[PDB]
Design a protein around this nucleic acid. Structure first.
Ligand SMILES: [Mg+2]
Ligand SMILES: [Mg+2]
Ligand SMILES: [Mg+2]
Ligand SMILES: [Mg+2]
Ligand SMILES: [Mg+2]
Ligand SMILES: [Mg+2]
Ligand SMILES: [Mg+2]
Ligand SMILES: [Mg+2]
Ligand SMILES: [Mg+2]
Ligand SMILES: [Mg+2]
Ligand SMILES: [Mg+2]
Ligand SMILES: [Mg+2]
Ligand SMILES: [Mg+2]
Ligand SMILES: [Mg+2]
Ligand SMILES: [Mg+2]
Ligand SMILES: [Mg+2]
Ligand SMILES: [Mg+2]
Ligand SMILES: [Mg+2]
Ligand SMILES: [Mg+2]
Ligand SMILES: [Mg+2]
Ligand SMILES: [Mg+2]
Ligand SMILES: [Mg+2]
Lengths: 129, 88, 218
RNA sequence: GCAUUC
RNA sequence: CGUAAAGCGCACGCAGGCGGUUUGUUAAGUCAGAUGUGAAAUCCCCGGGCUCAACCUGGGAACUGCAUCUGAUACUGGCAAGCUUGAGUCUCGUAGAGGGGGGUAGAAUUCCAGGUGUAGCGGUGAAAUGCGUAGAGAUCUGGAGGAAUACCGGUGGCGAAGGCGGCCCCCUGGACGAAGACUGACGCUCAGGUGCGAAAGCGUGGGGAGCAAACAGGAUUAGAUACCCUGGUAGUCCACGCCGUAAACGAUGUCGACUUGGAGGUUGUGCCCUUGAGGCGUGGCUUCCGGAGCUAACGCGUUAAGUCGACCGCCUGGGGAGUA
């Protein structure tokens, strides 16, 4: 059964990037929008949109630079089978700062750089390259 | 499996009305009716393993539904088992 | 311009999925090309060829199918460019210095034929060696005076001449190709979707490119 | 048809 | 963990692990700060002293931990109310060697009785054993009995797997389609456990035509405890129970999502419909070839061995040994 809406979300971007799809659509959720919201901030996805009220659907407009996928790599870190919690000083850095790790802090979902600046830890959701 | 006339009677008896076929009691009642009916079938068809597999599926399904009904509200679960005379 | 012809593609079962953007519809079980999309791309390639011609570059025409063997030669005669109208020998460009000796042989063989020193009583000299002329003329005749690698490749079928496309990519030479529904993109820098076998279509293509080079050459 | 071994 | 060691034969399932979506609430997990504690030495960092060094020594950091208090609420969990997409129920249909019980038919083999009929038949590479003048084989008529269902028949269908082919009836499981209604997370996986599980084999009682381990004879051969031939018992069949193993194989665990295509088969369905052994869509199952990608390679390739997630099983050089 579907037990990782987040992992399925990330898989669609990875599969969509490989297939050179302009955009991908999937069921929407507040958590998914939170991840989608941060990703758009740094320019990994050109935009995201939600359609429907009883059956909301999240569509992400993927982008490409020089004909190759912008998202070089994206992997789930915290999983229901094994979840990861990092402290303020234990926040990881992806590709020595070039990448960003999405962290679910008490103040909301934000990048590791933002969490480090704010000085809060939380769940490490995924690494984006 | 079960005749339409018998199926309608169970639905109208355990459900809120004649078109409420999704009620847990209706589902349990329908499964219980078929399980009781099949008792005679396997009494003489002792070696009929393939259809017996389907029977255990109904047995497991009924137990799963009963557990859900007990969890959601014990009051109705107690009434349902008394009327069906099961869980002995 | 967007005139008749060209739009007729191959059968649906022979299509190549990679060109889904460049197809318009499966009319009568045969895909038909998006002409309005073709024109901006065709003009772009024509403009690029003019720019290459402007810098005294060399563009070589590659057509192997019998439906285009004669047409390409006419284009190479309307302008002063090179062509290959028969089988494209493997390694025409990767090891051009190897076939360079074959070109030299034509110069000697041509010299004997023209100067008359081959007119000797022996039929080995008169026929056995002279027959090698059209063997190499029909094979290397259109590439005799290149003097090196080209500066751009014009191909009438990106799949039938896939060997030519692969060599051009290895050497980095720009590639212009008429790509039909069943052909393979991503090997051609500038893809010209359209029919490759219709006589009225092939003549328009090579006829069109042969005009830009002359004006670009000035 | 049968027909081993170094 | 397809073929190198490694996916239980296949299922159902408790404990356990994990779980769609919305709101409120709790603040257990989690996170932030503070306090107490975390002996000294040692390690660690900046200094000091023995001629330098080892060594000794000052201060700091560190001791990643634990407990309490104060706060944060994104995520997980608890609690409450929801929602319909997961899952399930109902209505109407469709296909099928799905399973259990009973009956019945036709062709053929063998045997038994009788007629016609005469010297061979049968078998092999060749031959013999064998059968036959006590009348065989061949041919015709009647009868008995057992087993399997030609053609249809098809990388066709069904089933969890093993597996399942004449026809008819009785009982019965699952799957799929069309719209419509209903329940409202009731789900996924599964150690132990439980059930099913080819063939051979075992127990009791039947049946026994054909076939056939063992066995016998005749050949072959240097020998032939074999291959070939003529015979032939257990077994193969039925009822009940046991056995629980197969190269039980797709050598590929189960469930869910995602990712270019092409040509067929099979089984539903919508639609245009006069220009039918038509035209365009939409589901389930299934065969073949191939793209990206993956792989040590071979190859796999929307039915993944691609990209991910949940859970379980299993492997750690060969032999000894799946043996004591
Ligand atoms: Mg010896
Ligand atoms: Mg092996
Ligand atoms: Mg093995
Ligand atoms: Mg297996
Ligand atoms: Mg949840
Ligand atoms: Mg707390
Ligand atoms: Mg200390
Ligand atoms: Mg000192
Ligand atoms: Mg010290
Ligand atoms: Mg909650
Ligand atoms: Mg077990
Ligand atoms: Mg047996
Ligand atoms: Mg027996
Ligand atoms: Mg017996
Ligand atoms: Mg024998
Ligand atoms: Mg085994
Ligand atoms: Mg088998
Ligand atoms: Mg098989
Ligand atoms: Mg195995
Ligand atoms: Mg299971
Ligand atoms: Mg393949
Ligand atoms: Mg043993």
């Amino acid at each position: 059964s579907m037990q990782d809406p987040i992992a399925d979300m990330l898989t669609r971007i990875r599969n969509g990037q490989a297939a050179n799809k302009a955009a991908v659509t999937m069921p929407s959720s507040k958590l998914k929008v939170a991840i989608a919201n941060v990703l758009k901030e740094e320019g990994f996805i050109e935009d995201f949109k939600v359609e429907g009220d009883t059956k909301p659907e999240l569509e992400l407009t993927l982008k490409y630079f020089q004909g190759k996928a912008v998202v070089e790599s994206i992997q789930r870190v915290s999983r229901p089978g094994l979840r990861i919690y990092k402290r303020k000083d234990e926040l990881p850095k992806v590709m020595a700062g070039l990448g960003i790790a999405v962290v679910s802090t008490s103040k909301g979902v934000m990048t590791d750089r933002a969490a480090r600046q704010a000085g809060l830890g939380g769940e490490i959701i995924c690494y984006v390259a | 499996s079960l005749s339409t006339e018998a199926t309608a009677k169970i639905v109208s008896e355990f459900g809120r009305d004649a078109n409420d076929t999704g009620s847990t009691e209706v589902q349990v009642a329908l499964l219980t009716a078929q399980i009781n009916h099949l008792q005679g079938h396997f009494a003489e068809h002792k070696k009929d393993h393939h259809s017996r597999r389907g029977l255990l599926r109904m047995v497991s399904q009924r137990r799963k539904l009963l557990d859900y009904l007990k969890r959601k509200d014990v009051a109705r679960y107690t009434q349902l088992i008394e009327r069906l005379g099961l869980r002995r | 311009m967007l005139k008749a012809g060209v739009h007729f593609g191959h059968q649906t079962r022979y299509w190549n999925p990679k060109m889904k953007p460049f197809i318009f519809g499966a009319r009568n079980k045969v895909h038909i090309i998006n002409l309005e999309k073709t024109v901006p791309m065709f003009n772009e390639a024509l403009a690029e060829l003019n720019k290459i011609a402007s810098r005294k570059g060399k563009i070589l025409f590659v057509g192997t199918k019998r439906a285009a063997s004669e047409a390409v030669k006419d284009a190479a005669l309307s302008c002063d460019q090179f062509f290959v109208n028969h089988r494209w020998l493997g390694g025409m460009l990767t090891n051009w210095k190897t076939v360079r000796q074959s070109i030299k042989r034509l110069k000697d063989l041509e010299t004997q034929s023209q100067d008359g020193t081959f007119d000797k009583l022996t039929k080995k000299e008169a026929l056995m060696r002279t027959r090698e002329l059209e063997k190499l003329e029909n094979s290397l005749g259109g590439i005799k005076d290149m003097g090196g690698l080209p500066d751009a490749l014009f191909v009438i079928d990106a799949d039938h001449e896939h060997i030519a496309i692969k060599e051009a990519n290895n050497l980095g030479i720009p590639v212009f190709a008429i790509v039909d529904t069943n052909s393979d993109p991503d090997g051609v820098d500038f893809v010209i979707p359209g029919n490759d076998d219709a006589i009225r279509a092939v003549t328009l293509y090579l006829g069109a490119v042969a005009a830009t080079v002359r004006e670009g050459r000035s």
